[PDB]
Every structure is written in structure tokens, then in C-alpha cells.
Write a protein that binds this ligand. Structure first.
Ligand SMILES: NS(=O)(=O)c1ccc(C(=O)NCc2cc(F)c(F)c(F)c2)cc1
Ligand SMILES: NS(=O)(=O)c1ccc(C(=O)NCc2cc(F)c(F)c(F)c2)cc1
Ligand SMILES: [Hg+2]
Ligand SMILES: [Zn+2]
Length: 258
């Protein structure tokens, strides 16, 4: 009665309502490190998050989004394979019920515990609504999470999850610094793709970081305690909200490093 990740409304069914699901530039994809083309013309990424203004965190029934004020060029992404300035609008995660799965993208078929997506829209389009209608409208920075040591910068997010346990719940979330979620290196792979959830619009330039960040078992456990359902409805734990790898088709994955 609406898409989800369940047996009856999961990824295998999305194509019925969103035919683009079987499109030419769908995400995520498997990154085969041996076939990725090192491209020397790729410029380094420019991540300027020092003026980032987070405002709210909400459980939307599919994942939890941390939203940022994108009214001005406060937190932007430029450089890399990008042409123009991209403003950060929100970030969310995809994760699994077990540590051996959770990521959307895979590297040489290897799945990580989770995947962080920092969503940005191209400023030349005026608003996000217009950007999703363009081939280069969005830029998503993907970061893999592996279970190991705790990530201090992630704890503030972890602590607030209790207040947004169910669908539709939101909590004020100001003064969060997204710089605390970045790995040391900004080396990346890039390819043209799409949103990984319906409407599955093919308007995204994907930039997937090579270096994952570590999070503790305890930190990822808290993600698994969220609910897909709203208050008063049957409880369904929010886990495995990831889409399986899609055919690469006529696309080439470029790498910024040798
Ligand atoms: N400036 S703000 O904090 O008041 C604000 C925050 C989030 C959104 C939003 O998520 N729209 C949906 C949405 C988000 C995306 F990231 C997209 F790519 C998209 F197409 C639609 C809009 C405004
Ligand atoms: N996991 S990910 O990075 O690929 C991803 C990022 C953002 C969104 C999103 O904003 N959906 C809202 C939304 C509502 C609409 F009505 C739209 F038209 C639209 F494009 C997006 C979905 C997936
Ligand atoms: Hg598009
Ligand atoms: Zn995502």
C-alpha cells in the first residue's frame, strides 16, 4: 500500500509503480576495483561544511534524516567530477540486521555494516524540486561504515534516536557538525546513477569514498532499534533498509586514485 523493504513491498516490487527501477542508470552498483578507470583529470573534492546548520532529525518510515538549512551556501560540495556548487540538504543511513550487510554499494562484492548518504542539490536549479528533474541535479557523497571502534562524532545522532523511534516523529537537532562523520582521506570513485529509493530518479552523480569510517557495535545496535511503523501500529524493526546492487549497463566507474 506504499513501498518499503518488506517481502511484499520491497525492491523487487518497486518497478510496478516506478518503471524507472529497470532504467539505464540505477543505483546502487557494485564497485569492481579492477575495472574502475583511474581518471587523472578528476579534481580533488572540496567539502566546505564549516557553516553547516542542522535543524531537525526525523524518522520518515524508511530511515532517519538529519536536515540542514539550505537557504544559502552554508554547507557545500564542489570539485571532484562536479561542475557547480552543491548545497547539503540532508544525510541518512542505510543499515542491516547483521554486521555483514547494510550498505547499498558494495566493493568487489563486499558489503559493509551500513552506508551514510550526504545528499546535495545543484544550486543553479534554484530549489531541490527542480534539481531532481535534471541529469546532474544531485550529488550524493557515500561513506561506508564498518564495525570497529566508536565514532565520537556519530554519538550525538545515536543519543537522540530514542525520541524518534516511530514513523513521523521528529526532534530538534541543531548545531550538529557533519565534519565529524568524514574519513581521513577523500579519495573516491564516481559514476552517474539515481536515487536508491522511489521515485528512483536518475539525477545523481555518485561520489563514493574509498575509506570507510568505523563505528562501534553499540552504535549500530541503536540504529536497529528504530521502527518502520508509526506509534500504535504493529512493531517492525527498521533494519535492512537497503537496495541490492543494480546492473552497471553502459556506465563506467571512475576513480580519483591509482
Ligand atoms: N531547508 S529545510 O531544512 O527547511 C529542508 C529540509 C529538508 C527538505 C527535504 O528533505 N525535501 C525533500 C527532498 C530531499 C532531498 F534531499 C531530495 F534530493 C529531494 F528530491 C527531495 C526540505 C527543506
Ligand atoms: N539513498 S539516496 O541518497 O539515494 C536518497 C536521497 C534522497 C531521497 C529523497 O529526497 N526522497 C524524497 C523525494 C520526494 C519527491 F517527491 C521527489 F520527486 C524526489 F525526487 C525525492 C531519496 C534517496
Ligand atoms: Hg533527473
Ligand atoms: Zn540513501
Amino acid at each position: 500500500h506504499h513501498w518499503g523493504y518488506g517481502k511484499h513491498n520491497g525492491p523487487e516490487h518497486w518497478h510496478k509503480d516506478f518503471p524507472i527501477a529497470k532504467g539505464e542508470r540505477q543505483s546502487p552498483v557494485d564497485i569492481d576495483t579492477h575495472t574502475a578507470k583511474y581518471d587523472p583529470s578528476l579534481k580533488p573534492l572540496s567539502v566546505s561544511y564549516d557553516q553547516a546548520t542542522s535543524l531537525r532529525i526525523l524518522n520518515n518510515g524508511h530511515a532517519f534524516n538529519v536536515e540542514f538549512d539550505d537557504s544559502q551556501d552554508k554547507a557545500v560540495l564542489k570539485g571532484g567530477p562536479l561542475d557547480g556548487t552543491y548545497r547539503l540538504i540532508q544525510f541518512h543511513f542505510h543499515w542491516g540486521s547483521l554486521d555483514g550487510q547494510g550498505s547499498e554499494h558494495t566493493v568487489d562484492k563486499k558489503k559493509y555494516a551500513a552506508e551514510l548518504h550526504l545528499v546535495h542539490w545543484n544550486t543553479k536549479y534554484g530549489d531541490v524540486g527542480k534539481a531532481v528533474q535534471q541529469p546532474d541535479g544531485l550529488a550524493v557523497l557515500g561513506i561506508f561504515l564498518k564495525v570497529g571502534s566508536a565514532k565520537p562524532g556519530l554519538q550525538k545522532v545515536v543519543d537522540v534516536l530514542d525520541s524518534i523511534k516511530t514513523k513521523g516523529k521528529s526532534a530538534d537537532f541543531t548545531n550538529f557538525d557533519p565534519r565529524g562523520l568524514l574519513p581521513e582521506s577523500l579519495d573516491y570513485w564516481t559514476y552517474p546513477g539515481s536515487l536508491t529509493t522511489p521515485p528512483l530518479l536518475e539525477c545523481v552523480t555518485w561520489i563514493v569514498l574509498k575509506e570507510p569510517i568505523s563505528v562501534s557495535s553499540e552504535q549500530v545496535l541503536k540504529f536497529r532499534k528504530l521502527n518502520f511503523n508509526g506509534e500504535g501500529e504493529p512493531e517492525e524493526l527498521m533494519v535492512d533498509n537497503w537496495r541490492p546492487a543494480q546492473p552497471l549497463k553502459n556506465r563506467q566507474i571512475k576513480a580519483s586514485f591509482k
